[PDB]
Amino acid sequence: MRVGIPTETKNNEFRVAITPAGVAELTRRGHEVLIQAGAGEGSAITDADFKAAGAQLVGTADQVWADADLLLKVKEPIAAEYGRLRHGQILFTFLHLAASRACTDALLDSGTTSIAYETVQTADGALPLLAPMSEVAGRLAAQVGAYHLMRTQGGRGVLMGGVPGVEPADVVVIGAGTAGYNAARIANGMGATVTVLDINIDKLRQLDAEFCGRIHTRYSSAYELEGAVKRADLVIGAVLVPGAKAPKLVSNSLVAHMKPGAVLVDIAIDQGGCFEGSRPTTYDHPTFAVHDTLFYCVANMPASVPKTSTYALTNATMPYVLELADHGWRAACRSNPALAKGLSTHEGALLSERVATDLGVPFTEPASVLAHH
Amino acid sequence: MRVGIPTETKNNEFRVAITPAGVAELTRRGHEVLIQAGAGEGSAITDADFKAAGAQLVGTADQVWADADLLLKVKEPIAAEYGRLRHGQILFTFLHLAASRACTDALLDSGTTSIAYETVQTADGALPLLAPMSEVAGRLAAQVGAYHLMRTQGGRGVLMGGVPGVEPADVVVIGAGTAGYNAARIANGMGATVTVLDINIDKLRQLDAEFCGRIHTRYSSAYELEGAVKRADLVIGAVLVPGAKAPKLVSNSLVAHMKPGAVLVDIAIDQGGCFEGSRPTTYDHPTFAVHDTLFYCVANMPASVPKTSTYALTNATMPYVLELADHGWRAACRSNPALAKGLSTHEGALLSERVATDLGVPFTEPASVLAHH
Amino acid sequence: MRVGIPTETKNNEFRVAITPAGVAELTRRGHEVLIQAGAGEGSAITDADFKAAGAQLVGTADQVWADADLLLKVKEPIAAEYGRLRHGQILFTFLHLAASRACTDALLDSGTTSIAYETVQTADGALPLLAPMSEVAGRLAAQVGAYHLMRTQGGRGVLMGGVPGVEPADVVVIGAGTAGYNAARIANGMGATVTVLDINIDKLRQLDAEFCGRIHTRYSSAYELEGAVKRADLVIGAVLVPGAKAPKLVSNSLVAHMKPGAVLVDIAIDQGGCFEGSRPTTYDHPTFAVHDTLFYCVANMPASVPKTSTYALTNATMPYVLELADHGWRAACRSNPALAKGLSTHEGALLSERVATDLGVPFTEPASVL
Amino acid sequence: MRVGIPTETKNNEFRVAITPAGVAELTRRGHEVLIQAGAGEGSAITDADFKAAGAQLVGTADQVWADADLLLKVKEPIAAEYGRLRHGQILFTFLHLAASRACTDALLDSGTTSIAYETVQTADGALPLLAPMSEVAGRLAAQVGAYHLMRTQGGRGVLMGGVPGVEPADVVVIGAGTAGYNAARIANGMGATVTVLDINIDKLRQLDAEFCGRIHTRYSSAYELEGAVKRADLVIGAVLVPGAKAPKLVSNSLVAHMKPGAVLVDIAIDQGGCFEGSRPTTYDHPTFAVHDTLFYCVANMPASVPKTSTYALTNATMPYVLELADHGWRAACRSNPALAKGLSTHEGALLSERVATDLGVPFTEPASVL
Numbered sequence A, B: 001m002r003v004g005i006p007t008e009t010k011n012n013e014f015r016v017a018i019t020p021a022g023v024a025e026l027t028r029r030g031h032e033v034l035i036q037a038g039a040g041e042g043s044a045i046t047d048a049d050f051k052a053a054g055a056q057l058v059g060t061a062d063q064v065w066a067d068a069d070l071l072l073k074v075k076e077p078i079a080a081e082y083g084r085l086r087h088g089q090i091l092f093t094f095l096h097l098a099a100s101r102a103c104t105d106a107l108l109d110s111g112t113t114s115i116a117y118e119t120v121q122t123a124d125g126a127l128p129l130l131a132p133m134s135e136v137a138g139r140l141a142a143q144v145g146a147y148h149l150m151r152t153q154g155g156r157g158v159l160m161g162g163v164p165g166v167e168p169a170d171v172v173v174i175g176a177g178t179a180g181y182n183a184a185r186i187a188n189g190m191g192a193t194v195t196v197l198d199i200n201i202d203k204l205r206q207l208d209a210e211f212c213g214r215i216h217t218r219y220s221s222a223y224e225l226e227g228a229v230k231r232a233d234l235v236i237g238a239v240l241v242p243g244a245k246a247p248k249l250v251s252n253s254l255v256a257h258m259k260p261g262a263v264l265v266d267i268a269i270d271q272g273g274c275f276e277g278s279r280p281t282t283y284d285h286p287t288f289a290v291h292d293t294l295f296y297c298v299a300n301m302p303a304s305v306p307k308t309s310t311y312a313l314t315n316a317t318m319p320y321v322l323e324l325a326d327h328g329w330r331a332a333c334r335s336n337p338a339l340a341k342g343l344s345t346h347e348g349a350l351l352s353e354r355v356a357t358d359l360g361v362p363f364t365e366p367a368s369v370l371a372h373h
Numbered sequence C, D: 001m002r003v004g005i006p007t008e009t010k011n012n013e014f015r016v017a018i019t020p021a022g023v024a025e026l027t028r029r030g031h032e033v034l035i036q037a038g039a040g041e042g043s044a045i046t047d048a049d050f051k052a053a054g055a056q057l058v059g060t061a062d063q064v065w066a067d068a069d070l071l072l073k074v075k076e077p078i079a080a081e082y083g084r085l086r087h088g089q090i091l092f093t094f095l096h097l098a099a100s101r102a103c104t105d106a107l108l109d110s111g112t113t114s115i116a117y118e119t120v121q122t123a124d125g126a127l128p129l130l131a132p133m134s135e136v137a138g139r140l141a142a143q144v145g146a147y148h149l150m151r152t153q154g155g156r157g158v159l160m161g162g163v164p165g166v167e168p169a170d171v172v173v174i175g176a177g178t179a180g181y182n183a184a185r186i187a188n189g190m191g192a193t194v195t196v197l198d199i200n201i202d203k204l205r206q207l208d209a210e211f212c213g214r215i216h217t218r219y220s221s222a223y224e225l226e227g228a229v230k231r232a233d234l235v236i237g238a239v240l241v242p243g244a245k246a247p248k249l250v251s252n253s254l255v256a257h258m259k260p261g262a263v264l265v266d267i268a269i270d271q272g273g274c275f276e277g278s279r280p281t282t283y284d285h286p287t288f289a290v291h292d293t294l295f296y297c298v299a300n301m302p303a304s305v306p307k308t309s310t311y312a313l314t315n316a317t318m319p320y321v322l323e324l325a326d327h328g329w330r331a332a333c334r335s336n337p338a339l340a341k342g343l344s345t346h347e348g349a350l351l352s353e354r355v356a357t358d359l360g361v362p363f364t365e366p367a368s369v370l
């Protein structure tokens, strides 16, 4: 088949959905790889690099979308792209549909077959395609929160680690999964006093073992979260219900009780945000004020480190890409239950139950389009 | 005596040279404390805070300078303050004279008695007043370097710590003293691969013990510096020869051979900069390009974290401030050789040999102004 | 029943198939334990140590083999022992039958019932009796790579950990499984800069968390693998692909590009080696040159630390030995599918499909004898 | 001035007294650096590497010695080199003149000015040019001890780290100084249970603080030492008594009570062993039996890892070398009392009191030549 990779178009999106190694492997398997000229430049992959691997370089985004049977992207199609969505094409990208009725409507109305990276889910419950991005986003959350804590950024004016005799920053991380663990680890590596909250006590046990209690753990209740957030210099919101809209855990009323100059980084903004006051921001204008605090709500965090994140992502996705290319969406999803959990839309049908409930749209069973005859 | 603390006037300087605890202790000792209205607001110390501790709040900077027997500051006087310098006043602050003939001439021509925080030196050779600021600046250098490595900042687009399976940032720190050690420590905590260079092998031994060889150490020669710098994503310049102009260790020629979008943070900018291309920058406009790299050269780094740095500084300076108030400069310096080593100017005489050598200006022995009659 | 443990007879094999602790447990359960005099001396277990535990010490190998209902060994029987193989006896040892037609035929001709340690396999797919040997081999690879890096051994002359101000050895481990993990851990403890490569990202993620990034991890793409190997003073090959010969990941062409005196330790030599240029070496002549490089490829690494290895193995085999002794092979294999997976021969029948196809011998389904 | 570096000519000596970094610093300052073709090959430094840094490479040892004002070496001049020693040249190398009347007399007869690396000494009493060699030797001790513990080398057959469920090696380090600290650190990083003994309780506190109690510490007495050694798989002797030969802390009688196959590495063999049974061993035959134990006694351990050792040493000597070249011996020694402590010979006068006492030669006070 033809697999196509357009340039990413979201604000400051420097990533690309394939590397030369992946192109050479698709070409070796008999596939045709079409890449928009310049697509890899943000990640320092030249057109010449992609060409040497076996790709054909096309001039326009229109032609990539039109000719590709399998379309690989990094982020979700935005408004100026909805017109390129096709019936009978497979879209394989991050989608975050529970957070976007407009994105969902566009996919459904086009009749396309889309599979979301972030809902591909193995039997142990892990999300292997989201994982590398959560690792990047969590590590970044610690450094951006540290940066915005500087008084020159409107922040409280506290050094992450303090210095001998002087208190460090108090950091609260909500969520002890991939992003929360990575945020906690880097914040702790910067010398900050880190508390992590989760409702999953086994994830708290993992953190407790790994850092020998140096990273504090608290069972997450409204009662506990409220007290921890009031004491915080920096709050990192890192919760997830897979494929679903994030719960609002930090109320604006609570934020009104925070220290002036406190910073809140909502990593969960891609799924709607776990702070009441959260709304999507961009790398161009990443922050806004709520009461006396600073909110940071960038929904494509890993875009700023594309030399890291482009490879981290494709290291994980390529095995699924190869199966989709070789066998098509239906056979690949039948052969691989984890891939099938990524099924999002097909021929006008919403195949995600959580997204269906979250948006108030009718739900079609994934087992129906995968049923045998 | 009257001890006067004006508002700092350097770009983004939120620190103040005393706290209410210090003010209360001088007042207890029978000294009058004059503070410019608003001097502590950057460090969240209100005029009310200073008044409750016993300070007289004054409206203008002109009055503080004119009335004060001992004038406490954080940074060196700048041009708009040159006219405020006075004969018969003791000025106690960070001076960095070897890096400013203009500041030196202004202090000499005024006839003022000045004592540099950064040359107060104990018999073991340590600089106890520079140290806390070096700790702050070193920790900041790592977080600020990480930030500027983001592609959105014009950086290489590499995450400090990488993520599993993907290479982390390569960080080179020049200088294994207080600032370098602290920069290495934080960069390493962020997951970067850190190499520290020094000519002092016992400082390398210290780092090797502390992080179990996780922080790499290399004997500093031009040859090792070159190889190290060419491989670096982030270079942190942290060398010092106490009281002297910093040596130029990274040439513009070497910078031309660096990776595109590499970041170089010159902490040693306050002594003239240890990179050939360094010139002083501000928190408003901190970076500029040299060849295909970004230089960061802020000479007042600890100003961005005044909640940490004002307290760290005053924790260290206050013991000396008390001796100067109680006994005046000559008796205090006679009784404390460490304080005497900070002596910089008196009545048009330059009392620092390193500054005199580096500026090509006549030197007068500190012992001669301290001699008994 | 009677459990017999003879002295190992293969060259440089100093291990033994039981310790005093296992002897005491068998004996407490009512079993007789027969041990050949001197069997434990290679592993620093004296005859007195075994007797104190309850063993009957026996003068000759013949008597042990003759009187044992269950015969425990470390290595496969070799040619001078083929006549000792016995119908109605259970043999439990490392067999590696796909590697020896001679051994397979001897086992088949003997009518004996044999169970191989290396194919005992639990439901998650782990091999609990190979595991301890992979741990030992991994840890040894770091120590032996360090030694051979000394210029007096023909290596580059680089100390694993450097000294302050001086560059440590650059160590690359290919494979993040049991042996590779253990290799990485010790080499990192010796102060080397360690990079681990794997195609399994979960295993890299585990290494990253455990050492907080001290041990570097790279996804095993051709570009990353070749880059890492070119920079390396020491390469440790610790790859296994289930059911297959080791892939040749390091080509002679790549080796021509390495630093002179660089050392390559191929743990996976027991599956053919994961370097193009690997071939079996010996404790007598453990290294050979390929290009300007030193290869080390010893197939029986754990034999070199028999005091450690004997305990690692027998701690792992113990629960299976106790079930076999208490219940007999058929009931024990019926009750424990992990054990049943080790079933190798019974009464002239070959019970492993992999061995059967590899050797060109008729396969008999294990279900048919159970 | 002209700084000359000849090839080392002692058997198995493959270090060199300068690196390209050193050559570049000397040449940037306007000095001429002359290096015998092939001098750095043992340390993986090619003639090309030296030339690129600014060295002139010369075909013969004779030319280097004849043309050099400052002659840098690693070992003492040997008999074949006595004819090359010159009045008006400065020699800077490890000399150990107390150990050789023949070398001392050749230096005196020649009229040469010589400075011993090993007696350069700062005010706190430290020997900064011996220090990197003690670091290398201590780290090497742990790796070679691990290797010789293998049963295939005649050791007990014990892996340093054990493996889960199995006992690690018991390692005893005698001396918590530079070599001892470094041996303890590497042996601990290999997973061994390490106990360090010293009479200096402050060195013990440093070890306790730095490894959080994981490295065990015991006050050194004959009684404690007897107990520790009897439990040890590996003993590392790393004692130094300033101004004296190594005390014999481990008697042959004690060695008789040790575990069979225990390994003892005597780092202090250069002063001429802290074990009663120690005698010089060689890289050809590095170990020998005492009772049921294996002794390792190599007097030049750092020559094993020349790439590491050369850089460790020459990074240490570099600032002294730059002073000598920039300012000549007289001004450099006057300005640096540490450097002056290394003064050995000048114009037939012997400037070390210790050497003059030991050999029965007249002593000339170094201050009288300065």
Ligand SMILES: NC(=O)C1=CN([C@@H]2O[C@H](COP(=O)(O)OP(=O)(O)OC[C@H]3O[C@@H](n4cnc5c(N)ncnc54)[C@H](O)[C@@H]3O)[C@@H](O)[C@H]2O)C=CC1
Pocket (backbone or CB within 6 Å): A118, A130, A131, A133, A134, A137, A174, A175, A176, A177, A178, A179, A180, A197, A198, A199, A200, A203, A220, A238, A239, A240, A241, A246, A247, A249, A266, A267, A268, A269, A270, A271, A298, A299, A300, A301, A302
């Ligand atoms: N902004 C960006 O660029 C990126 C955002 N993300 C987002 O980060 C979020 C977290 O991702 P992962 O850490 O990979 O997920 P994860 O599933 O590994 O962890 C989420 C954790 O939140 C916990 N949790 C759920 N509800 C909770 C509650 N009410 N109170 C306390 N804890 C609760 C869960 O128990 C779980 O341990 C997701 O929305 C993900 O899409 C990920 C990558 C990039």
Ligand SMILES: NC(=O)C1=CN([C@@H]2O[C@H](COP(=O)(O)OP(=O)(O)OC[C@H]3O[C@@H](n4cnc5c(N)ncnc54)[C@H](O)[C@@H]3O)[C@@H](O)[C@H]2O)C=CC1
Pocket (backbone or CB within 6 Å): B118, B130, B131, B133, B134, B135, B137, B174, B175, B176, B177, B178, B179, B180, B197, B198, B199, B200, B203, B220, B238, B239, B240, B241, B246, B247, B249, B266, B267, B268, B269, B270, B271, B298, B299, B300, B301, B302
């Ligand atoms: N920009 C800012 O806001 C601040 C700057 N600083 C500055 O940072 C600099 C370093 O301060 P500290 O770390 O406290 O000094 P320190 O004395 O503790 O350490 C300096 C280190 O540089 C090494 N060094 C000197 N010359 C060298 C050479 N040629 N090559 C390699 N290494 C060499 C020394 O051996 C020493 O270990 C000073 O200039 C200090 O004033 C300190 C605080 C704030």
Ligand SMILES: NC(=O)C1=CN([C@@H]2O[C@H](COP(=O)(O)OP(=O)(O)OC[C@H]3O[C@@H](n4cnc5c(N)ncnc54)[C@H](O)[C@@H]3O)[C@@H](O)[C@H]2O)C=CC1
Pocket (backbone or CB within 6 Å): C130, C131, C133, C134, C137, C174, C175, C176, C177, C178, C179, C180, C197, C198, C199, C200, C203, C220, C238, C239, C240, C241, C247, C249, C266, C267, C268, C269, C270, C271, C298, C299, C300, C301, C302
């Ligand atoms: N020489 C000796 O004396 C001994 C050798 N061994 C052998 O060592 C080998 C490794 O054993 P274990 O560590 O227990 O296996 P394991 O199954 O625990 O791990 C092997 C790893 O190799 C990885 N791998 C596969 N293909 C790869 C590639 N292209 N690049 C990088 N990594 C890749 C796998 O993903 C897996 O994580 C086996 O052949 C085993 O029999 C074991 C004991 C002793």
Ligand SMILES: NC(=O)C1=CN([C@@H]2O[C@H](COP(=O)(O)OP(=O)(O)OC[C@H]3O[C@@H](n4cnc5c(N)ncnc54)[C@H](O)[C@@H]3O)[C@@H](O)[C@H]2O)C=CC1
Pocket (backbone or CB within 6 Å): D130, D131, D133, D134, D137, D174, D175, D176, D177, D178, D179, D180, D197, D198, D199, D200, D203, D220, D221, D238, D239, D240, D241, D246, D247, D249, D266, D267, D268, D269, D270, D271, D298, D299, D300, D301, D302
């Ligand atoms: N074989 C070789 O190639 C090399 C040998 N060496 C030798 O290693 C030896 C040790 O050197 P360094 O560690 O640098 O000396 P060091 O002075 O740093 O430390 C020696 C330690 O031995 C301790 N010690 C003295 N008497 C003791 C006793 N009765 N019990 C326990 N501890 C005692 C001292 O308190 C001191 O802490 C020296 O003889 C040195 O020449 C050094 C380099 C290479």
Ligand SMILES: [Mg+2]
Pocket (backbone or CB within 6 Å): D323, D326, D327
């Ligand atoms: Mg000079």
